[PDB]
Amino acid sequence: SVGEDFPSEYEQWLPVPDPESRRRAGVLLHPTSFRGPHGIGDLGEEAFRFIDWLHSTGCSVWQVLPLVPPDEGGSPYAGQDANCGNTLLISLDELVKDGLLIKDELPQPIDADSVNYQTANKLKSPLITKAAKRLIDGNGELKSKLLDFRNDPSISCWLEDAAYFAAIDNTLNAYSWFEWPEPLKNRHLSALEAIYESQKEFIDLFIAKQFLFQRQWQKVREYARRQGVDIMGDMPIYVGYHSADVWANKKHFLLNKKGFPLLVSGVPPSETGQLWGSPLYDWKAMESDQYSWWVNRIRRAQDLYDECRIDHFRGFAGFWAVPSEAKVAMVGRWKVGPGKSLFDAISKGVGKIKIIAEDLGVITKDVVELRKSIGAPGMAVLQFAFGGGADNPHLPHNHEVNQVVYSGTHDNDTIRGWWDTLDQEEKSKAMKYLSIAGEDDISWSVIQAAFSSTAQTAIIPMQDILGLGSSARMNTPATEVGNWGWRIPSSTSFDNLETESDRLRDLLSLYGRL
Amino acid sequence: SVGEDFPSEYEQWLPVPDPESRRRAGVLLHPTSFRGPHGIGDLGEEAFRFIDWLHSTGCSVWQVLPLVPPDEGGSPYAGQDANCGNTLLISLDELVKDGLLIKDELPQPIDADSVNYQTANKLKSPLITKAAKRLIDGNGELKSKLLDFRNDPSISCWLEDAAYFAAIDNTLNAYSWFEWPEPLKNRHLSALEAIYESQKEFIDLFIAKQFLFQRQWQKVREYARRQGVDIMGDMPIYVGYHSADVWANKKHFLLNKKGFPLLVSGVPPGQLWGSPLYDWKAMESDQYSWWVNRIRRAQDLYDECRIDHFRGFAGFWAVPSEAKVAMVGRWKVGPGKSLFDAISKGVGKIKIIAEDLGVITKDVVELRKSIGAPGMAVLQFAFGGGADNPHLPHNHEVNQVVYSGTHDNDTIRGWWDTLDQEEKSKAMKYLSIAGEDDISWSVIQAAFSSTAQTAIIPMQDILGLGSSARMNTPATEVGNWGWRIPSSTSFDNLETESDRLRDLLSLYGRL
Ligand SMILES: *[C@@H]1O[C@H](CO)[C@@H](O[C@H]2O[C@H](CO)[C@@H](O)[C@H](O)[C@H]2O)[C@H](O)[C@H]1O
Ligand SMILES: *[C@@H]1O[C@H](CO)[C@@H](O[C@H]2O[C@H](CO)[C@@H](O)[C@H](O)[C@H]2O)[C@H](O)[C@H]1O
Ligand SMILES: OC[C@H]1O[C@H](O)[C@H](O)[C@@H](O)[C@@H]1O
């Protein structure tokens, strides 16, 4: 009490750093990019090697792109399913360890500078199928774990729908499920039973393949955790029309009486607007079952990742809605999103979540208030920092603590590529703010600025750690070809990036991110 | 409703920057440091010129040290009064504009490269006194404003005590008020009346001089505001024993029956400051009226105010007055948030900066945060220890004031010059350094690049000066508080410096 003596240990009663405030860094690297002989990266030895290398740098976060089955262009953002894993990421060597293939059955290696998905599928799928077949034919330990996975209720609430959808899509020659015969289109119960009987094998194999992905991914994730590395995933806010997600939950979407979307996704203008064309959620319909679809989706995201970015997070506050009739985006209108009640339901259903809000571009007051109300960090991207003036939110002096800072994302050129095409006056602006040595090392200048930020989390693409040019760019938006193909050059092994490792560690040490 | 349409003006509903979050910068410069002929800086032409220069740089804050009457060493932190102004800051030329002196009466100029207080007093006091005398003898506008000032209740609750204390101190040859005869020591009413009769002139002149300080300071402060400059003051948490503050409010302090302090201020590993301490629970009983009045006077003088040794509001070190070493003392519980409750109840919205340096405890941080006061970061302290040092830019917070150094630190050049090697190569990795001659701009730039909302630079570092321009060296008793801007350097002569600051403020969004 006021005036009185303190206990004798007053002088030692110091503030202690909050553990949840710990500064950290990480690397954005999608597993398709790993080296190896089978035309695409996978969840085998290169993933563990990369984890060991990441750990040796002092980084404690690994960010991946969505791990869903991609479209035929390779895009993880136009996946065929929101919850399934990309089975082309399955390691054939790991399957040999599991006793599902023998070494002699492995294909002759191929050189694939870049991922060609068609090539990877022709090479790998037959062998994955054969492994999945032996798994299902066996009795024993591994079979028993398939059955647990399959009968686990939090797997089956998406897996069975996904397997039936895939069986029907395989059986039928049709553009999309809109064109399916009515009993399959609208999931008549006896039609579904008839499908199970006639496509039983396909369904069992599909499920077995999802088990193999899950098993190999969970080993990667447990290895990461043992080495102090959290994994940060990614999810687009919208899912595609031709998927089990929509087909098996039509009432949760804005579809007409025939199952065609009334309204589709997009954004307004500069431009004539931008038309994405995804189906939209019936948010008030979802409100009525306590948002169960989204709750299940987050439960699957938790199963895969420690943390998850949500692309186009602004859509939870307000979304642009275009008449599906239209061929241009400008015709739509803004609609009211579910707001915080969604995240209330999720937290009630799943518990504590770690979400990152992708909140780039022009966003409204309600977006910022929603993001803050659930305590989600937003993003800063240094590549965007040098247009306009000193109020640009991407400049380090405007960064916030609860924020994730990138040098660039998978949608941007590499730092070297970006530097190379940078117009004068954005460039001399950058030169004043950044500490630049030689231009060849421009990517380290930007890395350093990200690390020096007050943002709690700094994330760098592997391409920039390797100092690579525009040919290593992962994606160029609004192009339909040449994306998602980058792989680490077959010469660069994780055993040979110790200079890079040391340099990162020096920076992380200097800026308190170890 | 979820799903329904937004109004049509949704696309234009953008976040707006909060005006109270505006990034800004400023300069620490105490007015005694201004150039001029009368042996000390003052509230005349140089103050206005400096404000014009500050404005031309884009800075929007001017920080000063306490404006109280200093001790004979010049220290504004061991003042003779907590609320009075330093009358040696009064400008003689401004008095001529007021018609209280004529130009002919102004003294011959003297060279005073540094402030000598004794020299300034001999030169200026006779003329200030003469001005004060004409003011009280006159019958017009200015006289009428003296009377309003004098009878204004928020002036008289400290001014009358201050004037009587000064009159008694003048009349008596005594070390301190402890040695005064009982009726004056304990303020017997008839003794106070006898003082008024016998020292009437002294008291009226004292009051008039405080009016002249107030008037000149308010003019400086209005001029600052007209040019977009807020003024940030400073106040020490403790006041000195030999002052009206203690004498007229004995019950609010920890004094024995005879009026001698039971306990005095300090800090452990120790350092003995020797100020009387507050009787916080006694203060609790009149809703902290003494502190409330103090903040009211701080509001009158400044837009914002730093409080030195802010940790003392949560816990303070208390040494037996008996002692003359600090290590024999104990930590006591401070008033905490209930003090600031009372202040805000009494005065309204305040803008306080917590001086929260050195080793501070959990309760200090929780109190500071509970009232939303910004704390400090000082780049000169950033390079000892490791990357968790709170003074490193990457650990700065928004609600914070960052300095290159304070008046207690060497200049950046002086600091660089004595810096040991571990710390120096550490600094070289964090800072962007060109030549050693410009080390102060490297640090200025780092302050400006911080996320801290307010960056404050001493004028000595803008001028790139060495250790001889250091304002104060703690725990020394001589050679402090004397620095003046070199008589060669005029504000008309610092456009390069102005431009260079403006470039940096523009780059880091502080304009
Ligand atoms: C955020 O979401 C967008 C989609 O709205 C992604 O865009 C990429 O993927 C789509 C589908 O393959 C493609 O149409 C775009 O050209 C491409 O930019 C972003 O990658 C996400 O960050
Ligand atoms: C913070 O407080 C102390 C004392 O209130 C000031 O210290 C200066 O003044 C005292 C008293 O004149 C002297 O003993 C010290 O050596 C000197 O540093 C600081 O300047 C304030 O910032
Ligand atoms: O320079 C004197 C300083 O000493 C200590 O660091 C005190 O905590 C601080 O209140 C004071 O300003």
UniProtKB/Swiss-Prot annotation, chain A:
Molecular function as annotated in GO: 4-alpha-glucanotransferase activity
One Pfam family from the UniProt entry? Glyco_hydro_77
List GO terms (cellular component aspect). Answer: amyloplast; chloroplast
What follows loss of this gene?
Increased amounts of maltotriose and leaf starch.
Q: What is the species listed in this Swiss-Prot or TrEMBL entry? A: Arabidopsis thaliana
Query: Is Nucleotide-binding included in the keywords of this UniProt record?
Result: no
Q: What's the top EC group for this one?
A: transferase
The record ties this protein, via InterPro entries, to: Glyco_hydro_77, Glycoside_hydrolase_SF
Enumerate the subcellular locations listed in this protein's record, separating them with semicolons.
Answer: Plastid, Chloroplast; Plastid, Amyloplast
- The question of whether Ion transport is a record keyword is answered with no
Specify the protein name: 4-alpha-glucanotransferase DPE1, chloroplastic/amyloplastic
- Protein family (similarity comment): Belongs to the disproportionating enzyme family.
The record's Gene Ontology biological-process terms are: glucose metabolic process; maltose catabolic process; starch catabolic process
Primary localization: plastid
Name the job this protein performs: Chloroplastic alpha-glucanotransferase involved in maltotriose metabolism. Probably uses maltotriose as substrate to transfer a maltosyl unit from one molecule to another, resulting in glucose and maltopentaose. The latter can then be further metabolized to maltose and maltotriose by beta-amylase. Required for normal starch degradation in leaves.
Q: Which domain of life is it from?
A: Eukaryota
What UniProt keywords apply to this chain's record, in alphabetical order?
A: Amyloplast, Carbohydrate metabolism, Chloroplast, Glycosyltransferase, Plastid, Transferase, Transit peptide
Catalysis: reaction(s): Transfers a segment of a (1->4)-alpha-D-glucan to a new position in an acceptor, which may be glucose or a (1->4)-alpha-D-glucan
Read off the PANTHER family from this record.
Answer: 4-ALPHA-GLUCANOTRANSFERASE DPE1, CHLOROPLASTIC/AMYLOPLASTIC, 4-ALPHA-GLUCANOTRANSFERASE DPE1, CHLOROPLASTIC_AMYLOPLASTIC
Q: What is its EC number?
A: 2.4.1.25
